[PDB]
Amino acid sequence: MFWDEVYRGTPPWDIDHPQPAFQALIESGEIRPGRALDIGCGRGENAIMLARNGCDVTGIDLARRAISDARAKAIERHVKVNFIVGNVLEMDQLFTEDEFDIVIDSGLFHVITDEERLLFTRHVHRVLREGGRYFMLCFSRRASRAEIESTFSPLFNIIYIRDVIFDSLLNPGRRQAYLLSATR
Template sequence: MDRDIRTTEDVLRLLDSLFAPDADRWTDDAGSWWDGFYADRSKPVPFFVDKPDENLVAYLDRGLITPGRALDLGCGPGRNALHLASLGFEVDAVDLSPAAIAWAEDRAREAGAWIRFHRGDAFALTGTALNGPYDLIYDSGCFHHLPPHRRISYLALLDQRLAPGGHFALTCFAAGGMGSELGDQEFYRQARLHGGLAYTPESLRWVFSDLEEVELRRMHDEPAQSPCFGEPFLWTALFRRNGRP
């Protein structure tokens, strides 16, 4: 007889277990799934390119965000972390996959960039690993792989790590473009995440309603020769935390 539920985290972990093996894509034990995904660096995966997101470049060019301390959630091969470091940001970058971190470290060495890379679950890394506060928390493609209940952990991370006056920027699957449009309850009935959750502008505004919206739009479709990455099946969003820096 199991009577293991005592804390909110116990409940979250129980709900995590409902999504096995889908949970292997985003929990702290996800290294094997994502390592296989990143094993062949020559695969024609859109975000394998060594280019920063077009919206991130635009935020910086327009002065919406300025250099400071940055956290890149789900950094993958490090393309956005590298861009931030090249502009003077002090960057922490975290990913579940050792293969992704190794690739990002290779790119950083080639570019002569100094970035603190961390392998693990951003919700569990504490202390000196991801100690914040951060002026910018950037997420390109991590949030839409989380099951609904882990939005609680995600918002707690923002609350704990994002500095007053700091910015949170996100790219995620857009409803009608990519990702599953099932309602939250249905994911639990089916015990599958179907490759990722699609969001509407209204749902993003609701989830992040404690933050001030700066901009929310579709990502621009960037041609192959562009110096930036851009796919129109993604939303891009920039939010600001109220308070003085």
């Protein structure tokens, strides 16, 4: 399966630290610690950072190798995180509605197929608590912001879309990104 193949190596988003956009949300107090879900969590850096800052954290990813490596990191860093193999489009089998204070999405929405985009937003909306926060980080230009807005505004109250930086292993390193903050 494609995502098993990418985690045979180190893809360009697979940095050795959490994304600064999410870490800044924690360090500024914009996010208050709570029950958090990291969808498409990859090798777990953002989920582990959330857990080290007092969140009760679950991470889900399709790729068993990413989940296994994420568990290894959690053990290495003496942090408790529930890392599970699973499909975000089947979360009605894994989580309840209204369960999570925080859902973070670091590059998952970016790779959801256009056919499944509406189903994706419904699953995310379902597991977010009333008044919870969905944070979605993706690559940015002008139409990138317009499609984020059109995709999420039916189901979510959009709080903001913010220009931020994204760390990567690419040869410019720091790239341009958009951060969506939204509630239900």
